[PDB]
Every structure is written in C-alpha cells, then in structure tokens.
Design a protein around this ligand. Sequence first.
Ligand SMILES: CCNS(=O)(=O)Cc1ccc(F)cc1
Ligand SMILES: CCNS(=O)(=O)Cc1ccc(F)cc1
Lengths: 300, 237
Amino acid sequence: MNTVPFTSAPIEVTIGIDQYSFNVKENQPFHGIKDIPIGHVHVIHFQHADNSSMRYGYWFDCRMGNFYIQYDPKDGLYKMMEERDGAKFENIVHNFKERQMMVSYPKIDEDDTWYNLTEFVQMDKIRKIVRKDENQFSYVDSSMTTVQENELSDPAHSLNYTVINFKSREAIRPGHEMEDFLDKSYYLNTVMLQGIFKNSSNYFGELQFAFLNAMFFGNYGSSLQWHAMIELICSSATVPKHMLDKLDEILYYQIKTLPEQYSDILLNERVWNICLYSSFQKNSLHNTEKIMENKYPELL
Amino acid sequence: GAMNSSNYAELFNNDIKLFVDDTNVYRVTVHKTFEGNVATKAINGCIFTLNPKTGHLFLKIIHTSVWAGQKRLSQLAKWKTAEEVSALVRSLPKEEQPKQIIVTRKAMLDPLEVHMLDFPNIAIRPTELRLPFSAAMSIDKLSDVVMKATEPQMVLFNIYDDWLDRISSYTAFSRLTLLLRALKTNEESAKMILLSDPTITIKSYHLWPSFTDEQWITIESQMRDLILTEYGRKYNV
Ligand SMILES: CCNS(=O)(=O)Cc1ccc(F)cc1
Ligand SMILES: CCNS(=O)(=O)Cc1ccc(F)cc1
C-alpha cells in the first residue's frame, strides 16, 4: 500500500482520489493520502473552492516512482512531482503517518469498482495519449482538447486519442461504401483492432481512459471519444463474442459509477438509443441495457 | 449549408452546381399475388441530375436488373444514386466538375457524402425548397427513354430547350419549376394546356412545345390557374 505526501494544503480544495473525494480547508494540516492500492493506475484530482472552473489532476502508478503533491503559488495549482531520493521520501512519509496527517484510501474490501473501471488502463499506455515525456505521471484538465478537436490549438497540451471518423476514407473502402458505412466491422476489426490498437485490450483501455477523463474532469473531447468507441463496436455486425461480453461489463460499471446528476451532460441520447435499440448489438449488452433502463430511463 | 428562398439566386451564379433528385430511381407497381398476398414489381427508373444554370440534364436510367436479388431496395436506391452521381463526376473533366451538389431529399446526404470522400472540395448540400422534380417522368420524351431502356444507360438532354437564347437562367428555372409543379398537381390538365392546341409542334430535338414569348405568358398563366384551382379542389376554398 503506497502513499502520495503533500508538502501542505495552502488553498481550500476538494481533492479526489479515484472515485472518492474529500474537502480540505485553507491551511488545514493535511499531508496526503495513504493506503493506495498497488496494482492499478490511480488519479488524484482537484477542484479549488474559489474557482470550480478547471478541474485538473494527475494519472499515476506508485510502482513507477515516489510521487508527492506541492502547491505552486505562482501557477496557482497543486502540482505532482517525483522525489528521486527514496530515503528522504520514506522518512518524510513515515513522519506524516506517525502524526496521522493523512487520509486513508477508503476502499471497501468487497468493492471491485476501481478495478472494473481501470481493467485495461496502465501508466505507460496513458502517456501515448497524454504527452510530457519528462514525467512518469500525466496531467489532465477540463479544458484540454483532443487531436481530432484540433483538426476541426496548442499541440503539446492535447490528448492524442486515436481519431475515429465514420465518414472518412480510413473508415470506408473504395467500392464498399454502403457496406462499410452501414456495417462498420472492417473499420473496427481490420483498421482499428488489427492495425492501430493491435488487440481489444488496447481498444478497451482507450475507451475506459476516455470515460474516466470525461467523468472526473468534464472533458468534452474525452466524452466524444468514449461514445465514438462504443458506437464503433455497436455498429459492427461482426464482433468477437468475448469483446461484446467484456464491453457489456465495462459499460455496466461506467453507468453504475456515473453521478446521477451529471447524466444529462455525460450521456449522448442518440448514441445510447442507437446502441441499445437499433444497432447490430442491440441484444448483446444485457447488463448495460438493464442498468440504463433502471437508472436513466428518461434519456431513452 | 441548406439551400432555401433566401439564397435562391446562388443557383444562377457561375459556380458549377447540380441538383440530384432520387425520387424516380426505385419505382414499383404494387399488386396482388395468386394467393392473395401483395407483391411489388419494379419498373425502370432514373436519376435526375440537373445543372440549373445551363439546363443540362444527366438522366441516368436505372434498369430493373440492378435490383435483382437485392434486399432493402429503398435503402439501396439511395446508395446506387450516390454511386452513379460519383461516377458521373469522375467522368467529367476537372473544369466541368461541380463545386456543389444539392440533393432534393435529406436522406441522400450521407450516401452521397460517403461516395464523394475523394472530392473533399465538392460541397454536398440539402435544400428547404420543395422542388417538383419527381414530375420529370410526366415529360413524355423522358418517360419514353426510361421505359424503353433494356440496359443501364445515360441520356443527356437540355431541359430548357432553346429558352436561354431569349430568357435568363433564373426565368428558365422558374418556368421549368412551374411546368413541373403543374404536371405534379394535375398531370392530365397540365398536359392538356401544354398540347390542346394542335398548331404548336414540339421539335424533334426538344422536350416542350415551340411557344412564342407571348404564348409562354398565356401558358404560364394557365399553369398558375391550374395550381391554384387544384389547391381549391383540394382544400375546398
Ligand atoms: C518539501 C521537499 N521535500 S522532499 O524533497 O523530501 C520530497 C518530498 C516533499 C514533500 C513530501 F511530502 C514528501 C517528499
Ligand atoms: C494507439 C494507442 N493505443 S494504446 O494502447 O495506447 C490505447 C490506450 C490508451 C490509454 C490506456 F490507458 C490504455 C490503452
């Protein structure tokens, strides 16, 4: 069980750690988060009390280094940094634990929620979408645009999600126009799974990474990416059976975790109605359809 | 974006454009079977592709053999339309290719966009105008060539005959749409107007009768009356 130590908390802030959150008051004696489960990526995220604008945060994996948070009064945000001196770090941490200045990652033993939301998310793959090669952790915020958004403006500050475009030459084989547009299996299986992503583990990972950035940061381009990746599978007549079964589980846990009050902005009516009720896979997502119908029947 | 009453003169500027109407591509007669079920029999159809500035009509005849063994024919017809329009564009010299294609029905937008991906600079546009191009098969010479076709064929016409020698494109399009609207609302009457008088011939190389300027004014007035009349007989006013 690992720890993320904070130099201090100089400004009042709501801090998220994965699906959990807690409020810290201005200058409260808060020195970080302990008992973080090893084996998963994690995200630590922030919303300032004075300017709820810009939720921002950091994706990290404690197996890759020792990471701490220190507020920067010049740039006005809580920054993640890596400490390379393992012994100085173990020392500052043991001290803060002894003084009980840390919150404990509050995981219920029965609860597999975070695993289920991050099954194909890993820190090395995350860096292929969010780029800052000099750090082992990745910053994301509410306003960052995607490569596809930038085509339709700062490149370094962009989420490189794989561009999916149903009315594109990549999606449509010359001579198979109607076939490929009405049945996206060649785009899904040949172009994306066999050519770009390399397997379904990578496709599922980008789909999951897109959802979590949409949910935790209100990142609109990530929401677009999540829905496009769902729609590409649902609009394919030929999908491996194991992929459909896994997608049903992935979406079930996403819909389960979504805040009820954000469904209006985080769920696209057209995509979900098309996916659940019109698409080739309308009958292949039993768990997702049941939770959607019982939790958000208005959207449908 | 969409083409409507506000931007109407754009049709007659010097940017090449085509209207595409797919109404008459998939045509059927509905009938009873020996067992008392209902079946359809396809008949030849046509794509109506028209340059409104010059009157050039590219009439691609759709022979019933294209439907043999195919399913979901009304959907296929939209994609077949888009395939044939794309093939027409590719066949034209670059300087004759359109800058915009206006589809008369919004269901043609995605099929045509997908078939024209190789032409990113050709705009595919809908329209809010309710144009009467479905009535093209009420022009006797067009109906005749479609029904006689034994194989896929493209036939070129000038739908304005020689009118552009005497009138502008705007006026020629207005006359065409008036004639077609009349033929659509009451074909028998419209055709009686156009041809009751047996002293006005249709030239071999033309589609419509050889009316003088004055006769066109009478004709046009008679078509307006017809349209308002039928609008009366329809709504009881
Ligand atoms: C403030 C500088 N200290 S340090 O260099 O030892 C790295 C570190 C800082 C704060 C922590 F909570 C844990 C580690
Ligand atoms: C073409 C890029 N493929 S990828 O394998 O990097 C997708 C991916 C991105 C982020 C993840 F957390 C997991 C997977």
